[PDB]
């Protein structure tokens, strides 16, 4: 987290809980157009439909783009963009390794961009 | 949270499927064998996004089965320790809260909650309420939490959670 | 130790073991309890067709009843049997249990209203100290007016929608942002534009409850789009964006208006329909054997048209994954149309037309996106709870019937036969402590060793003298094993007593401690003898644990009802019957077989009973009088006043009244009753003879007790007269013998529904002695008729798909057809 626990996940792309939803529902509408789905996959789809804070693909693409120009660690682009802290303060109370990394000024601006995109 | 890591598998394909569509059978057996397996090295695997390449299929000497090495990109849920994650509470007990982070089932101890909140029996939404019902957590509540200890059973993976940080409450 | 606290205090034990703490009433809270409990539990049309096996004045009865339970802390038995005048005619003992149960619900409702009134108060204060939403006294009025816990959820949701986003209240750990974007629209201040719609939510709720335009739409002299420009911001650039945000606000404020949600709730309660479809798995797995066949498809089935437990089965199918169901108010003239007409202005100007279009589409979003979903889920929960209660009532009736059977009608000596093929047998004492054990391995040559077994049957019947022989119906083998003993009687009666409880006794670890060496079917025969001797004692003994009592089978679906409620219902049936019979404690102080009875006496329970028996083992004395109990056993006046009128004492061990259904507090009157049969001399005067039941002038004693004593003791005097007539007359129905249907059902282990005529079944053809004769796995005889008959066409030795044309319960006829013309349609 703050320091990373494994050695292999750091060079692995991190996904939001809304990229996952649009990828997982794509797999379904592939499947019934084509066997029955997994219990884990279906119930994870229900979980990520519960927390789909961006219902449209281009919104997720824009959110990922914005956080990409912000230049923060690839773990952090998914423990913010789907945690949607509302106050820069909320956000940092959340990421013990984000305080000190970024100044306070851009925090409200980026966070308000996330709550705008929902 | 949900990663996208390339990983490996070895499909032992039986000689029945040596027809014109053996590669499709490799793909189908990858989808059948991989999805749902809660490996502790690589977390939960939810869906196989794509199959990079179906490798050279080595015929096993004396066994008939062909071992196919498959590289594949799959959606992966590995919730690292010290993470703040959005659960969905499924049931309430005296010992704490049993929640569902998605694929993972999670636990919150009776002292892993803020101490201001207490169990409420004899209500068919059995719940942990405060004394003035400022925040009450019944079934199906999108509570944030902090996963502090992740432990592996090699059949399913469960992590434990707490709620002593700012905002770690109902949404 | 909480065990010590329970053992010490003078409350009824189940009062102390209640989740809610017990507290008194002030005759105003008590009247509110009575009226609310009556309206919510005794006169309320169940949505489902609930049949079973009262009146407005019951409120007073409930009133009176509640008084006891809350004030003098009288448990339900002590109220039910003695203070009958205050509750009877209407309040049966089961209705008193229902009053108790709904009291624990009313207490919870007041607790939640109390805290929430408190909260609204603090919030109102915060508001004052502080476009604007006012905590008027109407809010506190509805909060006090709350009657159900469903309304109390509406009021809470209403309060959370507007004033919820106020954490600094506890200031005088922050709130997580709510998922609805209504918070965002309120940050952007669209609520004012939401106000610019004609009606406020409350006025539309009044329109709904009155079904006409009691309030009038307030048109705004402009175009909605032109107001939209005033509000467009970064959050909502387009005027259509602010339009839709305002529509969403109007929808969410209509949804969380308690008047609107209440009226729509009532509409669902009256006019709602259940439509079922099968999933693909349910399009395959559903067959005629599956319980889903009767409803695999359904359309426009009103929720009020359902039956005993249909909805429980429907939800079971939906949980498995077979069915996709939906409860909707409109048919498949929609109820929205009334909503639209109430929220409508008829002015034909383009401005008013556009404002009305916005209003009606916003209220469409309110009705579909918010209200249908929540109210359908709530109605589903209510129907499921109704079905679970039905199942629990069915299990209660099963336990009632099994417990409503008298001991014996020839200390009774009984031999029990329990065939598994090693058959065993055990002989029961006059008090239950087994005398001996014996083995009679009857098997079907060796058809002469079975005659030898019959011979030793006769010899042991000549040696030991049992008044009844009992055979455990376990297979169809006992359908003729009764023949294998009944003629041996000629060299005393035979009864076929079922053995499922005996099977539990076999697997009972407690019984294994009782019988370490006795083989399984031998302990089963023991328990069969104990049951036929007295069912209640054995039921209390073996079913003293949750798993033990639950491992019996009262209903097929009993695994799908709330376990705690089922335990409570079965335990209250146990308590009912135990207190009706009474408990002779000094017998149980030596025989452990009866000990499990004592806990089911009112006031007393699982703790006070063990403490009492251990204390008597400290004195190592016999309880000859209940005065001895109160003095030596040092039992408080309340627990004594509860459990005295039911703890039997054997008089042949000294107030004889201790062996009667006469409470100590009412001893004196009883004496006076015997005095008017002309005390110490009268101890035997009516005991010896019911010389003149017309000697006692009932009305005169009743009016005298009204004038100088305590009034309305009429039925009490009648009870004392009937009790002095016969002491502890058991009212359990005299033990009959199983009818053909009962015998059929036990031996076949199958039910009239599972004996479905039309059922495609498995079968086994053994031998033909005319038509084809087969046997089921149950062992019954299935006759394939000659009319449907050739050896080659139907061979011998294998199994074949077959349909049950005709059945019989005394012949064990299971007639087949096997013709493929029948296997379809």
Curated annotation (Swiss-Prot), chain C:
The chain holds residues 284 to 1288 of 1726 of the full protein. The gene is SUPT6H. The modification N6-acetyllysine is found at residue 393. Residues 770-819 form the S1 motif domain. This is Transcription elongation factor SPT6. Ubiquitously expressed. GO terms for cellular component: nucleoplasm; transcription elongation factor complex. Keywords: Acetylation, Chaperone, Host-virus interaction, mRNA processing, mRNA splicing, mRNA transport, Nucleus, Phosphoprotein, Transcription, Transport. One of its GO terms (molecular function) is DNA binding. It comes from Homo sapiens. Residues 34-825 are annotated as: Interaction with KDM6A. Disulfide bonds: none annotated.
């Amino acid at each position: 987290s703050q320091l990373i626990f494994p050695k292999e996940f750091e060079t692995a792309e991190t996904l939001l809980n809304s990229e996952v939803h649009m990828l997982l529902e794509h797999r379904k509408q592939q499947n019934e157009s084509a066997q029955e789905l997994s219990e884990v996959f279906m119930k994870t789809l229900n979980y990520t439909a519960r927390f789909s804070r961006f219902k449209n693909r281009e919104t997720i693409a824009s959110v990922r783009s914005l956080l990409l120009q912000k230049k923060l660690h690839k773990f952090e682009l998914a423990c913010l963009a789907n945690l949607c802290p509302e106050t820069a303060e909320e956000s940092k109370a959340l990421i013990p390794s984000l305080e000190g990394r970024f100044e306070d000024e851009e925090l409200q601006q980026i966070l308000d961009d996330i709550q705008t995109k929902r | 949270m949900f990663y996208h890591i390339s990983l490996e598998h070895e499909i032992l394909l039986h000689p029945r499927y040596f027809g014109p569509n053996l590669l499709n059978t490799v793909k189908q057996k990858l989808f059948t064998e991989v999805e749902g397996t809660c490996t502790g090295k690589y977390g939960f695997v939810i869906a196989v996004t794509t199959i990079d390449n179906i490798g050279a299929g080595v015929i096993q000497p004396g066994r008939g089965f062909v071992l196919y090495p498959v590289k594949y990109k799959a959606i992966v849920f590995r919730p690292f320790k010290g993470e703040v994650v959005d659960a969905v509470v499924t049931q309430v007990n005296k010992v704490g809260l049993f929640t569902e982070i998605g694929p993972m089932s999670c636990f919150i101890s009776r002292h892993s909650i803020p101490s201001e909140m207490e169990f409420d029996p004899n209500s068919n939404p059995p719940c942990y309420k405060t004394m003035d019902e400022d925040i009450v957590i019944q079934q199906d509540d999108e509570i944030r939490l902090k996963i502090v200890g992740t432990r592996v059973d090699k059949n399913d993976i469960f992590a434990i959670g707490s709620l002593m940080d700012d905002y770690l409450g109902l949404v | 130790d909480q065990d010590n606290e329970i053992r010490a205090t003078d409350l009824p034990e189940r009062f102390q073991l209640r989740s809610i703490p017990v507290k008194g009433a002030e005759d105003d809270e008590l009247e509110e309890e009575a009226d609310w409990i009556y309206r919510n539990a005794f006169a309320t049309p169940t949505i489902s067709l609930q049949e079973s096996c009262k009146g407005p004045s019951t409120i007073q009865k409930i009133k009176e009843a509640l008084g006891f339970m809350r004030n003098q802390h009288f448990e339900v038995p002590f109220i039910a049997f003695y203070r009958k005048e205050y509750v009877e005619p209407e309040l049966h003992i089961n209705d008193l249990w229902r009053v108790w149960q709904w009291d624990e619900k009313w207490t919870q409702l007041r607790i939640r209203k109390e805290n929430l009134t408190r909260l609204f108060e603090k919030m109102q204060a915060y508001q004052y100290e502080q476009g604007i939403r006012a905590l008027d006294t109407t809010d506190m009025e509805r909060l006090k007016d709350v009657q159900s816990m469903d309304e109390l959820k509406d009021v809470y949701n209403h309060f959370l929608l507007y004033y919820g986003r106020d954490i600094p209240k506890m200031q005088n750990l922050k709130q997580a942002s709510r998922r609805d974007m209504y918070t965002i629209c309120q940050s952007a201040g669209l609520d004012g534009l939401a106000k610019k719609f004609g009606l406020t939510p409350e006025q539309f709720g009044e329109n709904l409850r009155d079904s006409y335009q009691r309030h009038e739409t307030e048109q705004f002299p402009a175009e909605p789009l032109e107001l939209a420009k005033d509000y467009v911001c970064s959050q909502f650039p387009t005027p259509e964006a602010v339009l839709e945000g305002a529509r969403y606000m109007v929808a969410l404020q209509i949804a969380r208006e308690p008047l609107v949600r209440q009226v729509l709730r009532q509409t669902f309660q009256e006019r709602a329909k259940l439509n079922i479809t099968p999933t693909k798995k349910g399009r395959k797995d559903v067959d005629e054997a599956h319980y889903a066949y009767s409803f695999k498809y359904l359309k426009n089935k009103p929720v009020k048209e359902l039956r005993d437990d249909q909805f429980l089965k429907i939800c079971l199918a939906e949980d498995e994954g077979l069915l996709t169901t939906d409860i909707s108010i409109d048919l498949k003239q929609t109820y929205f149309e009334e909503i639209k007409q109430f929220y409508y202005r008829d002015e034909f100007s383009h401005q008013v037309q556009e404002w009305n279009r916005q209003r009606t589409m916003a209220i469409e979003r309110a009705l579909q996106q918010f209200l249908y979903v929540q109210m359908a889920k709530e109605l589903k929960n209510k129907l499921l709870a109704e079905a679970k209660e039905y199942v629990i009532k069915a299990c209660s009736r099963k336990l009632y019937n099994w417990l409503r059977v008298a001991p014996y009608r020839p200390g009774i000596r009984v031999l029990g036969i329990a065939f598994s093929h090693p058959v065993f047998c055990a002989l029961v004492n006059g008090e239950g402590e087994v005398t001996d054990f014996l083995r009679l391995p009857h098997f079907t040559e060796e058809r002469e060793k079975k005659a030898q077994d019959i011979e030793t049957l006769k010899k042991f019947l000549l040696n030991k003298k049992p008044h009844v022989v009992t055979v455990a119906g376990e297979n169809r083998d006992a359908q003729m094993l009764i023949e294998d003993v009944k003629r041996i009687v000629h060299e005393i009666g035979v009864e076929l007593v079922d053995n499922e409880l005996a099977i539990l006794y076999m697997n009972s670890k407690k019984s294994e401690a009782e019988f370490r060496d006795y083989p399984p079917v031998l302990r089963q025969a023991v328990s069969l003898a104990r049951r036929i001797q007295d069912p209640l004692i054995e039921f209390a003994q073996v079913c003293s644990s949750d798993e033990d009592i639950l491992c019996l089978k009262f209903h097929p679906l009993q695994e799908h009802v709330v376990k705690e409620e089922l335990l409570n219902a079965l335990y209250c049936e146990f308590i009912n019957r135990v207190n009706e019979v009474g408990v002779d404690v000094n017998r149980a102080i030596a025989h452990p077989y009866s000990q499990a009875l004592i806990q089911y006496v009112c006031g007393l329970g699982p703790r006070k009973g063990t403490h009492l028996l251990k204390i008597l083992k400290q004195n190592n004395t016999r309880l000859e009088s209940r005065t001895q109990l109160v003095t030596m056993c040092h039992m408080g006046p309340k627990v004594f006043m509860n459990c005295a009128g039911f703890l039997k004492i054997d008089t042949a061990s000294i107030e004889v009244l201790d062996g009667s259904r006469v409470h100590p507090e009412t001893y004196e009157w009883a004496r006076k009753m015997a005095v008017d049969a002309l005390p110490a001399g009268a101890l035997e005067e009516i005991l010896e003879n019911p010389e003149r039941l017309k000697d006692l002038d009932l009305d005169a004693f009743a009016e005298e007790l009204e004038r100088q004593g305590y009034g309305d003791k009429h039925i009490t005097l009648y009870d004392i007269r009937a009790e002095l007539s016969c002491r502890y007359k058991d009212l359990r129905t005299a033990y009959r013998s199983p009818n053909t249907e009962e015998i059929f059902n036990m031996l076949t282990k199958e039910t009239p529904e599972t004996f479905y005529i039309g059922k495609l079944i498995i079968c086994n053809v053994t031998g033909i002695a005319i038509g084809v004769k087969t046997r089921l796995d149950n062992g019954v005889t299935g006759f394939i008729p000659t009319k449907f008959l050739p050896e080659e066409r139907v061979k011998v030795g294998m199994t074949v798909h077959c349909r049950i044309m005709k059945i019989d319960i005394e012949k064990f006829s299971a007639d087949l057809t096997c013709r493929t013309s029948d296997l379809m349609d």
